Structure 1
Amino acid sequence: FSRPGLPVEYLQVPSASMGRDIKVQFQGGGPHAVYLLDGLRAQDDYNGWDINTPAFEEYYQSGLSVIMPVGGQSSFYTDWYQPSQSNGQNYTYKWETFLTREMPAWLQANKGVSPTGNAAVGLSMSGGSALILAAYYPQQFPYAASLSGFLNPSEGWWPTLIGLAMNDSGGYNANSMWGPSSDPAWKRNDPMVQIPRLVANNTRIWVYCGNGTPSIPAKFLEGLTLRTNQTFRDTYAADGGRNGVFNFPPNGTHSWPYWNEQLVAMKADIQHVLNG
C-alpha cells in the first residue's frame, strides 16, 4: 500500500537475549519514533502493518521515524519464562528486552534515533503490550496506543482464552510465557492492573476498540472485548487519569483498514506529544 521509493530499510538487529538476529523494517525521519507492533500471527518476512496498510507512506515526512520489528508470533512482545513447551521452540522469547534495550541501543548508535520520547502502538495481541511498555518504561514511551487490545489479560477467563489463541497461532504455550494464571507475571503484564503507572507517569494513551469484524460466538467475544476496553477507560478515569483518547465508534471494525485509520488519526496527536 505504501508507494514505492520510500526510504525503508531492512535491518538485522542482533538480540543477545534471544541468541538470534531480529529483522526490523525501518524508515528514518526524526529522532523520535513510532514503534509499530504486530498482531498474534506476526510473520517472519514483513510486519503486518507493512503488509496491510500504507503506514510508512502515511508517516513519511511526519518528523517521526517508523520502526516495524518483524516476527514474534504469539509472543505478546514480552520476556518469557522459558522456550514454548510443545512446538519445539529452541530459545526463549525475550521481546521486552529486545524492544526496550537491544533495539533502541542499536538504533541510537547507528541511526541517531533517541531511546527516549517515542510512541508504542499495538493492535490485538500487542494493544496491551504497548500500554505495558509505557507503564514500565515511561521515558522510552510517553505515548502508547492500543487498537482492539485485550486489556485485562489476568482476569477471569482471559488467561485461558489467551492460551487457546496462542496455541492456534503456531502452537505456542501461555504457561511457558507467564506461567499459570496464578503467577505474578499475569498481573505484572495486565494493563488494567497497571493503570496507576499510566496515571502517575501522565502517559498519553490512545485506546481504540471496534464493535466487530467486517465479517455469534465471535459476537460474544467482541462484546466482551469492548466491555473490557470500556472498563479500562472507566478505571483509568477513576484512578485519576486525564491524558487519554478513547475511541469506541459503534461502526468501528476490527480490521486493518480501521486500524490504519486509527494510525492516521493519531499522527497529529503523536506529533504534538513527542515533537511539541
Structure 2
Amino acid sequence: AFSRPGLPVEYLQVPSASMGRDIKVQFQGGGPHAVYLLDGLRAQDDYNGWDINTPAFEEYYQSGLSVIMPVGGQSSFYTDWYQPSQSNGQNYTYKWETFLTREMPAWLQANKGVSPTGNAAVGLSMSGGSALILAAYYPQQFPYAASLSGFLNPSEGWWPTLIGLAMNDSGGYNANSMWGPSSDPAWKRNDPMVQIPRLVANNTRIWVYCGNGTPSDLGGDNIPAKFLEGLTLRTNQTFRDTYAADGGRNGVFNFPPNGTHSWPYWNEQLVAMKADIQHVLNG
C-alpha cells in the first residue's frame, strides 16, 4: 500500500474457536476505539484489500483511532453460515459474525486495550451491507457504520440470484450454504433494508455511499452493465427513502455523479468520513 517509512503496522494471528483456525488480522494501534475495515467479495488470505489497494493505514495514522483489517473470508459476507459451503470443498463453517463480535474484540481488548464498544464498521461491496447489519444487531459495539457500494436489499428481487452467481464466481462459494434458499429467514435477517427499523431505534450513525457506473464483483453474471446499474440505483434510492420514512435522522448519503464502484472512490469516501468518525466516536 506504499506507506511512508516509519509506520507501525502489525500482522496478528487471532485464534477463532468457532472456525477452528487462526485468523490473520492487520492492525494499526492509535486509540481505544477502532475502525473495522471489512474487505470485498474476493478477499484474499494474505492481505486485506484495503491494504492491497489503498493508503488507508497512513490516512488514519495518528487519527486517534485504531484500524483493524481482518484477513480472509472470501465471499463470506462476514456472516455466520448455516454450513460449510457445498460444492467447493470448504471443510469448516464460516462464523465471521461470531469472530468479529466476540472472538476478535476479546483478543484485542486483552492484548491491545482496544475497547469492544464504541467502534466503527466500514465495509465495501460484499461487506457494505455487513457493516450495517453488524451495527443493527450489535449497536454497543458499532454506533457507527459505513456501507460503500453495499448490497442494501440482498433478500429482494434480483439480488439473491446475483449474489449467488457472484459468490460462485468468487471461489465457488454457495449462497444456499450461507443463508439457505432465498425463502429462508436468514436472508431478511441480514438485509439492511429490512433492518432499517433497528438502525433507527439504535440511532446508528450511518454513512452510505452509492456509486455510479458498472457495479463491482458482478463481472460474471452475463448481464448487461446498464441493467445492473439500474437495479443498483433503484435499490439504493429505496434504501435512502425508506430510512427517512422510518424516522432515520443520523445518516449521510453520498451519490456523486462521477463516483465509481472502485477502490479509488472507496478510499475517497474513507478519507471523507474520517472527521465524521472522529467526532462521533471520540467527541
TM range (shorter): over 0.9
Question: 1:61–1:178: structure 2 CA closer, same or farther, 3 Å change rule?
Answer: same
Cα distance in structure 1, aligned partners of 2:124 and 2:72: 14
* Contact 1:143–1:270 (8 Å) recurs in 2: yes
Note the residue ranges of structure 2 that are not aligned, 5 or more in a row.
Answer: 217-222
The Cα offsets for residues 22-43 of structure 1, whole Å up to 9 and x where unpaired, read as: 0000000000000000000000
The Cα offsets for residues 237-259 of structure 1, whole Å up to 9 and x where unpaired, read as: 00000000000011111111100
Cα distance in structure 2, aligned partners of 1:219 and 1:3: 40
Cα distance in structure 2, aligned partners of 1:176 and 1:51: 29
Question: 1:159–1:144: structure 2 CA closer, same or farther, 3 Å change rule?
Answer: same
* Contact 1:2–1:53 (8 Å) recurs in 2: no
* Contact 1:37–1:122 (8 Å) recurs in 2: yes
Cα distance in structure 2, aligned partners of 1:247 and 1:179: 32
The Cα offsets for residues 174-203 of structure 1, whole Å up to 9 and x where unpaired, read as: 000000011000000000000000000100
Cα distance in structure 2, aligned partners of 1:260 and 1:199: 27
Q: CA deviation at 1:6?
A: 1.1
The Cα offsets for residues 142-175 of structure 1, whole Å up to 9 and x where unpaired, read as: 0000000110000112111100000000000000
The Cα offsets for residues 104-162 of structure 1, whole Å up to 9 and x where unpaired, read as: 00000000000000000000000000000000000000000000011000011211110
- Does the residue aligned with 1:107 lie in a helix, a strand or coil? helix
- Does the residue aligned with 1:35 lie in a helix, a strand or coil? strand
Cα distance in structure 1, aligned partners of 2:194 and 2:215: 31
Matched, 1:262 2:269: yes
The Cα offsets for residues 3-61 of structure 1, whole Å up to 9 and x where unpaired, read as: 23211100000000000000000000000000000000000000000000000000000
* Contact 1:207–1:247 (8 Å) recurs in 2: yes
Q: CA deviation at 1:223?
A: 2.4
The Cα offsets for residues 204-256 of structure 1, whole Å up to 9 and x where unpaired, read as: 00000111149981222122112211110100000000000000011111111
Cα distance in structure 2, aligned partners of 1:247 and 1:163: 27
The equivalent residue for 1:230 is 237
Cα distance in structure 1, aligned partners of 2:5 and 2:262: 24
Question: 1:213–1:54: structure 2 CA closer, same or farther, 3 Å change rule?
Answer: farther
* Contact 2:215–2:225 (8 Å) recurs in 1: no
The Cα offsets for residues 78-119 of structure 1, whole Å up to 9 and x where unpaired, read as: 000000000000000000000000000000000000000000
Cα distance in structure 2, aligned partners of 1:185 and 1:63: 36
* Contact 2:214–2:228 (8 Å) recurs in 1: no
The equivalent residue for 1:253 is 260
The equivalent residue for 2:70 is 69
* Contact 1:22–1:71 (8 Å) recurs in 2: yes
- Does the residue aligned with 1:34 lie in a helix, a strand or coil? strand
* Contact 1:134–1:142 (8 Å) recurs in 2: yes
Q: CA deviation at 1:2?
A: 2.5
Cα distance in structure 2, aligned partners of 1:167 and 1:97: 23
1:1-276 equivalence runs, <5 A = 1-213=2-214, 217-276=224-283
- Does the residue aligned with 2:145 lie in a helix, a strand or coil? strand
Question: 1:4–1:86: structure 2 CA closer, same or farther, 3 Å change rule?
Answer: farther
Number of positions where the alignment pairs a residue of Structure 1 with one of Structure 2: 276
- Does the residue aligned with 1:162 lie in a helix, a strand or coil? helix
- TM-score, normalized by length of structure 2? 0.96
Aligned-residue Cα RMSD (Å) equals 1.2
- Does the residue aligned with 1:121 lie in a helix, a strand or coil? strand
Note the residue ranges of structure 1 that are not aligned, 5 or more in a row.
Answer: none
* Contact 2:79–2:96 (8 Å) recurs in 1: yes
